[PDB]
Amino acid sequence: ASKRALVILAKGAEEMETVIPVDVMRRAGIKVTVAGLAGKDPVQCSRDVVICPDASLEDAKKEGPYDVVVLPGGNLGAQNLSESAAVKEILKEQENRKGLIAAICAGPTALLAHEIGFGSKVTTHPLAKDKMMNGGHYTYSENRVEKDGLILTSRGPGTSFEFALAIVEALNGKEVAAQVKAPLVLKD
Amino acid sequence: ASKRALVILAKGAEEMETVIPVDVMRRAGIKVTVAGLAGKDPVQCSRDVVICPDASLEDAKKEGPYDVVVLPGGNLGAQNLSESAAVKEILKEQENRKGLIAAICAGPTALLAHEIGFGSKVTTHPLAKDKMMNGGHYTYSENRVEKDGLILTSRGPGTSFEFALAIVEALNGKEVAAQVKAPLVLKD
Protein backbone atom coordinates (compact mmCIF):
# COMPACT_ATOMS: atom_id res chain seq x y z
CA ALA A 1 0.00 0.00 0.00
CA SER A 2 1.28 3.44 -1.05
CA LYS A 3 1.17 6.19 1.57
CA ARG A 4 -0.73 9.37 0.69
CA ALA A 5 -0.06 13.02 1.53
CA LEU A 6 -2.28 16.09 1.25
CA VAL A 7 -0.60 19.48 0.89
CA ILE A 8 -3.01 22.41 1.27
CA LEU A 9 -1.96 25.35 -0.88
CA ALA A 10 -3.46 28.79 -0.25
CA LYS A 11 -2.68 32.21 -1.66
CA GLY A 12 0.30 33.72 0.14
CA ALA A 13 1.87 30.38 1.08
CA GLU A 14 5.66 30.26 1.31
CA GLU A 15 6.54 28.57 -1.97
CA MET A 16 9.79 27.05 -0.71
CA GLU A 17 7.96 25.45 2.24
CA THR A 18 5.48 24.02 -0.29
CA VAL A 19 7.79 22.70 -3.02
CA ILE A 20 10.47 21.17 -0.80
CA PRO A 21 8.15 18.74 1.08
CA VAL A 22 6.21 17.85 -2.08
CA ASP A 23 9.42 17.08 -3.99
CA VAL A 24 11.06 15.15 -1.16
CA MET A 25 7.92 13.18 -0.38
CA ARG A 26 7.57 12.19 -4.03
CA ARG A 27 11.21 11.10 -4.03
CA ALA A 28 10.21 8.79 -1.15
CA GLY A 29 7.49 7.16 -3.24
CA ILE A 30 4.62 8.90 -1.43
CA LYS A 31 1.55 9.85 -3.47
CA VAL A 32 1.23 13.60 -2.90
CA THR A 33 -1.80 15.72 -3.75
CA VAL A 34 -1.22 19.47 -3.88
CA ALA A 35 -4.75 20.74 -3.25
CA GLY A 36 -5.72 24.35 -3.88
CA LEU A 37 -7.75 25.87 -1.07
CA ALA A 38 -9.83 28.03 -3.44
CA GLY A 39 -10.08 25.60 -6.36
CA LYS A 40 -8.03 24.16 -9.23
CA ASP A 41 -6.75 27.55 -10.36
CA PRO A 42 -3.07 28.55 -10.16
CA VAL A 43 -1.95 29.89 -6.77
CA GLN A 44 0.25 32.96 -6.32
CA CYS A 45 2.68 32.30 -3.49
CA SER A 46 4.24 34.80 -1.11
CA ARG A 47 7.22 35.54 -3.38
CA ASP A 48 5.06 35.50 -6.55
CA VAL A 49 5.98 32.00 -7.66
CA VAL A 50 2.80 30.65 -9.26
CA ILE A 51 2.07 26.95 -8.72
CA CYS A 52 -0.67 24.87 -10.35
CA PRO A 53 -2.36 22.55 -7.83
CA ASP A 54 -3.12 18.94 -8.68
CA ALA A 55 -6.75 19.32 -7.60
CA SER A 56 -9.15 21.48 -5.66
CA LEU A 57 -9.39 20.82 -1.95
CA GLU A 58 -13.07 20.00 -2.47
CA ASP A 59 -12.12 17.19 -4.87
CA ALA A 60 -9.11 16.06 -2.85
CA LYS A 61 -11.32 15.89 0.25
CA LYS A 62 -13.32 13.07 -1.36
CA GLU A 63 -10.25 10.93 -2.20
CA GLY A 64 -9.14 10.54 1.41
CA PRO A 65 -8.00 9.46 3.88
CA TYR A 66 -4.40 10.67 3.93
CA ASP A 67 -1.52 9.45 6.06
CA VAL A 68 -0.32 13.05 6.48
CA VAL A 69 -1.89 16.48 6.04
CA VAL A 70 0.69 19.18 5.33
CA LEU A 71 0.21 22.87 6.10
CA PRO A 72 2.88 25.16 4.61
CA GLY A 73 3.73 28.51 6.12
CA GLY A 74 3.78 32.05 4.84
CA ASN A 75 1.92 34.58 6.97
CA LEU A 76 -0.94 35.20 4.54
CA GLY A 77 -1.13 31.52 3.61
CA ALA A 78 -1.50 30.46 7.23
CA GLN A 79 -4.17 33.11 7.77
CA ASN A 80 -6.14 31.75 4.81
CA LEU A 81 -5.75 28.25 6.27
CA SER A 82 -6.87 29.45 9.71
CA GLU A 83 -10.06 31.01 8.31
CA SER A 84 -11.15 28.04 6.18
CA ALA A 85 -13.95 25.83 7.50
CA ALA A 86 -12.88 23.09 5.08
CA VAL A 87 -9.42 23.03 6.63
CA LYS A 88 -11.02 22.74 10.08
CA GLU A 89 -13.04 19.72 8.97
CA ILE A 90 -10.03 18.05 7.36
CA LEU A 91 -7.84 18.63 10.41
CA LYS A 92 -10.47 17.51 12.93
CA GLU A 93 -11.04 14.32 10.91
CA GLN A 94 -7.31 13.63 10.69
CA GLU A 95 -6.94 14.13 14.45
CA ASN A 96 -9.81 11.74 15.21
CA ARG A 97 -8.35 8.93 13.08
CA LYS A 98 -4.86 9.50 14.57
CA GLY A 99 -3.25 10.52 11.32
CA LEU A 100 -0.19 12.71 11.07
CA ILE A 101 -0.51 16.50 10.83
CA ALA A 102 2.56 18.49 9.76
CA ALA A 103 2.90 22.28 9.75
CA ILE A 104 5.88 24.56 9.23
CA CYS A 105 6.80 28.17 9.98
CA ALA A 106 3.55 30.16 10.33
CA GLY A 107 1.53 27.08 9.43
CA PRO A 108 1.10 25.78 12.99
CA THR A 109 -1.03 28.82 13.84
CA ALA A 110 -3.82 27.21 11.82
CA LEU A 111 -3.82 24.44 14.42
CA LEU A 112 -4.60 26.95 17.15
CA ALA A 113 -7.32 28.52 15.01
CA HIS A 114 -8.98 25.11 14.55
CA GLU A 115 -8.39 23.88 18.13
CA ILE A 116 -6.14 21.04 16.97
CA GLY A 117 -3.76 19.18 19.25
CA PHE A 118 -4.02 21.27 22.43
CA GLY A 119 -1.46 20.16 25.01
CA SER A 120 1.19 19.19 22.47
CA LYS A 121 4.75 20.43 22.17
CA VAL A 122 5.14 22.52 19.00
CA THR A 123 7.53 24.92 17.32
CA THR A 124 6.94 27.77 14.89
CA HIS A 125 8.86 30.50 13.15
CA PRO A 126 10.19 32.78 15.94
CA LEU A 127 8.01 35.60 14.58
CA ALA A 128 4.91 33.42 14.99
CA LYS A 129 5.55 32.34 18.59
CA ASP A 130 3.35 34.93 20.31
CA LYS A 131 0.40 34.07 18.07
CA MET A 132 0.74 30.31 18.58
CA MET A 133 0.97 30.71 22.37
CA ASN A 134 -2.09 32.93 22.88
CA GLY A 135 -3.89 31.17 25.73
CA GLY A 136 -1.11 28.77 26.67
CA HIS A 137 -2.74 25.83 24.88
CA TYR A 138 0.59 24.39 23.66
CA THR A 139 4.11 24.05 25.03
CA TYR A 140 6.72 25.83 22.93
CA SER A 141 9.93 24.30 21.62
CA GLU A 142 12.89 25.88 19.87
CA ASN A 143 13.92 22.63 18.18
CA ARG A 144 14.23 22.92 14.41
CA VAL A 145 11.80 20.02 14.05
CA GLU A 146 9.41 19.00 16.83
CA LYS A 147 7.20 15.91 16.97
CA ASP A 148 4.75 15.27 19.80
CA GLY A 149 2.35 12.41 19.21
CA LEU A 150 0.76 13.01 15.83
CA ILE A 151 1.76 16.70 15.60
CA LEU A 152 4.93 17.48 13.65
CA THR A 153 6.10 21.08 13.42
CA SER A 154 9.07 23.00 12.11
CA ARG A 155 10.35 26.52 12.15
CA GLY A 156 11.05 28.12 8.77
CA PRO A 157 12.11 27.93 5.12
CA GLY A 158 15.60 26.79 6.12
CA THR A 159 14.21 23.85 8.11
CA SER A 160 12.10 22.65 5.18
CA PHE A 161 14.42 19.77 4.27
CA GLU A 162 14.58 18.46 7.85
CA PHE A 163 10.79 18.87 8.12
CA ALA A 164 10.15 16.88 4.94
CA LEU A 165 12.58 14.09 5.87
CA ALA A 166 10.88 13.79 9.26
CA ILE A 167 7.61 13.19 7.41
CA VAL A 168 9.27 10.51 5.27
CA GLU A 169 10.77 8.83 8.34
CA ALA A 170 7.38 8.82 10.09
CA LEU A 171 5.57 7.31 7.09
CA ASN A 172 8.18 5.08 5.43
CA GLY A 173 10.87 4.61 8.10
CA LYS A 174 14.45 5.62 8.74
CA GLU A 175 16.07 3.67 5.90
CA VAL A 176 13.92 5.24 3.19
CA ALA A 177 14.59 8.66 4.70
CA ALA A 178 18.34 7.98 4.61
CA GLN A 179 18.18 6.71 1.02
CA VAL A 180 16.24 9.76 -0.17
CA LYS A 181 18.56 12.11 1.74
CA ALA A 182 21.87 11.05 0.22
CA PRO A 183 21.39 12.38 -3.36
CA LEU A 184 20.24 15.78 -2.06
CA VAL A 185 23.71 16.87 -0.93
CA LEU A 186 22.58 18.15 2.45
CA LYS A 187 25.25 19.27 4.91
CA ASP A 188 24.00 17.40 7.98
CA ALA B 1 19.17 50.82 -9.95
CA SER B 2 17.50 47.46 -9.26
CA LYS B 3 19.47 44.33 -10.17
CA ARG B 4 17.81 41.85 -12.54
CA ALA B 5 17.91 38.06 -12.69
CA LEU B 6 16.85 35.64 -15.42
CA VAL B 7 15.89 32.10 -14.39
CA ILE B 8 15.49 29.73 -17.35
CA LEU B 9 12.83 27.10 -16.66
CA ALA B 10 12.63 24.00 -18.85
CA LYS B 11 10.58 20.83 -18.60
CA GLY B 12 12.21 18.42 -16.18
CA ALA B 13 13.93 21.10 -14.11
CA GLU B 14 14.44 20.37 -10.41
CA GLU B 15 11.65 22.44 -8.87
CA MET B 16 13.41 22.97 -5.54
CA GLU B 17 16.50 24.32 -7.34
CA THR B 18 14.18 26.70 -9.21
CA VAL B 19 11.95 28.01 -6.41
CA ILE B 20 14.61 28.48 -3.74
CA PRO B 21 16.80 30.93 -5.73
CA VAL B 22 13.78 32.80 -7.11
CA ASP B 23 12.29 33.23 -3.64
CA VAL B 24 15.57 34.19 -1.97
CA MET B 25 16.54 36.59 -4.73
CA ARG B 26 13.16 38.32 -4.49
CA ARG B 27 13.63 38.60 -0.73
CA ALA B 28 16.86 40.46 -1.57
CA GLY B 29 14.99 43.00 -3.68
CA ILE B 30 16.20 41.59 -7.01
CA LYS B 31 13.80 41.72 -9.97
CA VAL B 32 13.56 38.08 -11.07
CA THR B 33 12.08 36.85 -14.34
CA VAL B 34 11.20 33.17 -14.48
CA ALA B 35 11.32 32.57 -18.24
CA GLY B 36 9.87 29.44 -19.82
CA LEU B 37 12.16 27.87 -22.39
CA ALA B 38 9.26 26.70 -24.58
CA GLY B 39 6.90 29.64 -24.05
CA LYS B 40 4.55 31.14 -21.46
CA ASP B 41 2.81 27.85 -20.75
CA PRO B 42 3.04 26.07 -17.37
CA VAL B 43 6.13 23.89 -16.90
CA GLN B 44 6.07 20.40 -15.39
CA CYS B 45 9.13 19.97 -13.20
CA SER B 46 11.02 16.79 -12.41
CA ARG B 47 8.85 15.89 -9.41
CA ASP B 48 5.63 17.00 -11.17
CA VAL B 49 5.34 20.37 -9.48
CA VAL B 50 3.85 22.64 -12.15
CA ILE B 51 5.12 26.24 -12.20
CA CYS B 52 3.78 29.12 -14.29
CA PRO B 53 6.62 31.22 -15.77
CA ASP B 54 6.51 35.00 -15.72
CA ALA B 55 7.24 35.20 -19.45
CA SER B 56 8.51 33.25 -22.42
CA LEU B 57 12.27 33.22 -22.92
CA GLU B 58 11.69 34.89 -26.29
CA ASP B 59 10.00 37.84 -24.57
CA ALA B 60 12.40 37.90 -21.63
CA LYS B 61 15.32 37.93 -24.09
CA LYS B 62 14.22 41.37 -25.32
CA GLU B 63 14.04 42.93 -21.83
CA GLY B 64 17.73 42.37 -21.05
CA PRO B 65 20.43 42.69 -20.00
CA TYR B 66 20.47 40.76 -16.72
CA ASP B 67 22.98 40.92 -13.90
CA VAL B 68 22.72 37.13 -13.48
CA VAL B 69 21.46 34.25 -15.62
CA VAL B 70 20.37 31.26 -13.55
CA LEU B 71 20.31 27.68 -14.82
CA PRO B 72 18.55 25.21 -12.49
CA GLY B 73 19.37 21.53 -12.47
CA GLY B 74 17.38 18.38 -12.97
CA ASN B 75 18.80 15.93 -15.50
CA LEU B 76 16.11 16.41 -18.15
CA GLY B 77 15.96 20.15 -17.52
CA ALA B 78 19.70 20.55 -18.07
CA GLN B 79 19.49 18.47 -21.24
CA ASN B 80 16.77 20.76 -22.58
CA LEU B 81 18.95 23.74 -21.69
CA SER B 82 21.97 22.17 -23.38
CA GLU B 83 20.08 21.62 -26.64
CA SER B 84 18.55 25.11 -26.90
CA ALA B 85 20.13 27.55 -29.35
CA ALA B 86 18.41 30.42 -27.52
CA VAL B 87 20.16 29.46 -24.29
CA LYS B 88 23.48 29.40 -26.17
CA GLU B 89 22.90 32.94 -27.44
CA ILE B 90 21.88 34.22 -24.01
CA LEU B 91 24.88 32.61 -22.31
CA LYS B 92 27.40 33.75 -24.93
CA GLU B 93 26.07 37.31 -24.65
CA GLN B 94 26.24 37.23 -20.85
CA GLU B 95 29.82 35.95 -21.00
CA ASN B 96 30.88 38.70 -23.42
CA ARG B 97 29.50 41.50 -21.22
CA LYS B 98 31.06 39.92 -18.09
CA GLY B 99 27.78 39.23 -16.36
CA LEU B 100 27.27 36.54 -13.77
CA ILE B 101 26.22 33.02 -14.80
CA ALA B 102 24.96 30.67 -12.07
CA ALA B 103 24.17 26.98 -12.47
CA ILE B 104 23.38 24.26 -9.95
CA CYS B 105 23.40 20.46 -9.82
CA ALA B 106 23.12 19.18 -13.42
CA GLY B 107 22.75 22.73 -14.70
CA PRO B 108 26.48 23.38 -15.25
CA THR B 109 26.52 20.74 -18.00
CA ALA B 110 24.71 23.27 -20.20
CA LEU B 111 27.83 25.42 -19.94
CA LEU B 112 29.91 22.66 -21.48
CA ALA B 113 27.32 22.13 -24.21
CA HIS B 114 27.48 25.84 -25.11
CA GLU B 115 31.27 26.20 -24.69
CA ILE B 116 30.88 28.67 -21.82
CA GLY B 117 33.65 29.51 -19.39
CA PHE B 118 36.30 26.96 -20.38
CA GLY B 119 39.22 26.98 -17.95
CA SER B 120 37.11 27.84 -14.90
CA LYS B 121 36.79 25.95 -11.64
CA VAL B 122 33.28 24.48 -11.32
CA THR B 123 31.29 22.01 -9.28
CA THR B 124 28.29 19.86 -10.14
CA HIS B 125 26.14 17.18 -8.61
CA PRO B 126 28.46 14.18 -8.05
CA LEU B 127 26.41 12.19 -10.57
CA ALA B 128 27.06 14.86 -13.22
CA LYS B 129 30.85 15.07 -12.77
CA ASP B 130 31.84 12.72 -15.60
CA LYS B 131 29.63 14.60 -18.08
CA MET B 132 30.95 18.03 -17.08
CA MET B 133 34.57 16.87 -17.33
CA ASN B 134 34.40 15.29 -20.80
CA GLY B 135 37.44 16.80 -22.52
CA GLY B 136 39.04 18.34 -19.45
CA HIS B 137 37.81 21.84 -20.27
CA TYR B 138 37.14 22.75 -16.62
CA THR B 139 38.78 22.07 -13.26
CA TYR B 140 36.53 20.23 -10.84
CA SER B 141 35.78 21.27 -7.27
CA GLU B 142 33.93 19.46 -4.51
CA ASN B 143 33.04 22.68 -2.69
CA ARG B 144 29.32 23.07 -2.04
CA VAL B 145 29.42 26.43 -3.82
CA GLU B 146 32.19 27.37 -6.25
CA LYS B 147 32.84 30.78 -7.82
CA ASP B 148 35.58 31.36 -10.39
CA GLY B 149 35.45 34.72 -12.11
CA LEU B 150 31.92 35.13 -13.42
CA ILE B 151 30.98 31.44 -13.13
CA LEU B 152 29.12 30.39 -9.98
CA THR B 153 28.21 26.74 -9.51
CA SER B 154 26.72 24.52 -6.85
CA ARG B 155 26.10 20.87 -6.28
CA GLY B 156 22.51 19.85 -5.54
CA PRO B 157 19.06 20.51 -4.08
CA GLY B 158 20.51 20.67 -0.57
CA THR B 159 22.98 23.40 -1.57
CA SER B 160 20.23 25.56 -3.08
CA PHE B 161 20.11 28.01 -0.16
CA GLU B 162 23.88 28.54 -0.14
CA PHE B 163 23.82 28.89 -3.94
CA ALA B 164 21.09 31.55 -3.84
CA LEU B 165 22.74 33.53 -1.03
CA ALA B 166 26.01 33.52 -2.99
CA ILE B 167 24.11 35.14 -5.87
CA VAL B 168 22.70 37.77 -3.51
CA GLU B 169 26.14 38.48 -2.05
CA ALA B 170 27.63 38.86 -5.54
CA LEU B 171 24.90 41.27 -6.69
CA ASN B 172 23.93 43.18 -3.53
CA GLY B 173 26.81 42.55 -1.11
CA LYS B 174 27.45 40.69 2.12
CA GLU B 175 25.20 42.77 4.38
CA VAL B 176 22.08 42.25 2.27
CA ALA B 177 22.88 38.54 2.10
CA ALA B 178 23.18 38.41 5.90
CA GLN B 179 19.93 40.36 6.38
CA VAL B 180 18.01 38.07 4.03
CA LYS B 181 19.52 34.96 5.62
CA ALA B 182 18.48 35.57 9.22
CA PRO B 183 14.68 35.10 8.88
CA LEU B 184 15.15 31.82 6.97
CA VAL B 185 16.25 29.83 10.02
CA LEU B 186 19.21 28.19 8.31
CA LYS B 187 21.54 26.07 10.43
CA ASP B 188 24.85 27.54 9.24
From Swiss-Prot, chains A, B:
Key words of the record: Acetylation, Autophagy, Cell membrane, Chaperone, Copper, Cytoplasm, Disease variant, DNA damage, DNA repair, Endoplasmic reticulum, Fertilization, Hydrolase, Inflammatory response, Isopeptide bond, Lipoprotein, Membrane, Mitochondrion, Neurodegeneration, Nucleus, Oxidation, Palmitate, Parkinson disease, Parkinsonism, Phosphoprotein, Protease, RNA-binding, Stress response, Tumor suppressor, Ubl conjugation, Zymogen
Effect of L9P: In PARK7; uncertain significance
Alphabetized GO MF terms: cadherin binding; copper ion binding; cupric ion binding; cuprous ion binding; cytokine binding; DNA-binding transcription factor binding; enzyme activator activity; enzyme binding
Protein name: Parkinson disease protein 7
GO cellular component terms given for this protein: adherens junction; axon; cell body; chromatin; cytoplasm; cytosol; endoplasmic reticulum; extracellular exosome
Impact after mutating C45S: No effect on mitochondrial translocation neither on deglycase activity
Expression by tissue: Highly expressed in pancreas, kidney, skeletal muscle, liver, testis and heart. Detected at slightly lower levels in placenta and brain (at protein level). Detected in astrocytes, Sertoli cells, spermatogonia, spermatids and spermatozoa. Expressed by pancreatic islets at higher levels than surrounding exocrine tissues.
Positions carrying Phosphotyrosine: Y66
Induction comment from the UniProt entry of this chain: By hydrogen peroxide and UV irradiation. In pancreatic islets, expression increases under hyperglycemic conditions. Expression is also induced by sulforaphane, an isothiocyanate obtained from cruciferous vegetables.
Site (Cleavage): D148, G149
Record family assignment: Belongs to the peptidase C56 family.
Residues with PTM N-acetylalanine: A1
Catalyzed chemical reaction(s): N(omega)-(1-hydroxy-2-oxopropyl)-L-arginyl-[protein] + H2O = lactate + L-arginyl-[protein] + H(+); N(6)-(1-hydroxy-2-oxopropyl)-L-lysyl-[protein] + H2O = lactate + L-lysyl-[protein] + H(+); S-(1-hydroxy-2-oxopropyl)-L-cysteinyl-[protein] + H2O = lactate + L-cysteinyl-[protein] + H(+); N(omega)-(1-hydroxy-2-oxoethyl)-L-arginyl-[protein] + H2O = L-arginyl-[protein] + glycolate + H(+)
Disease per UniProt entry: Parkinson disease 7: A neurodegenerative disorder characterized by resting tremor, postural tremor, bradykinesia, muscular rigidity, anxiety and psychotic episodes. PARK7 has onset before 40 years, slow progression and initial good response to levodopa. Some patients may show traits reminiscent of amyotrophic lateral sclerosis-parkinsonism/dementia complex (Guam disease).
Impact noted for substituting C52A: Strongly reduces chaperone activity and ability to eliminate hydrogen peroxide
EC class (word): hydrolase
Description of how the protein assembles with itself and partners: Homodimer. Binds EFCAB6/DJBP and PIAS2. Part of a ternary complex containing PARK7, EFCAB6/DJBP and AR. Interacts (via N-terminus) with OTUD7B. Interacts with BBS1, HIPK1, CLCF1 and MTERF. Forms a complex with PINK1 and PRKN. Interacts (via C-terminus) with NCF1; the interaction is enhanced by LPS and modulates NCF1 phosphorylation and membrane translocation. Interacts with NENF.
Cofactor note (record): Deglycase activity does not require glutathione as a cofactor, however, glycated glutathione constitutes a PARK7 substrate.
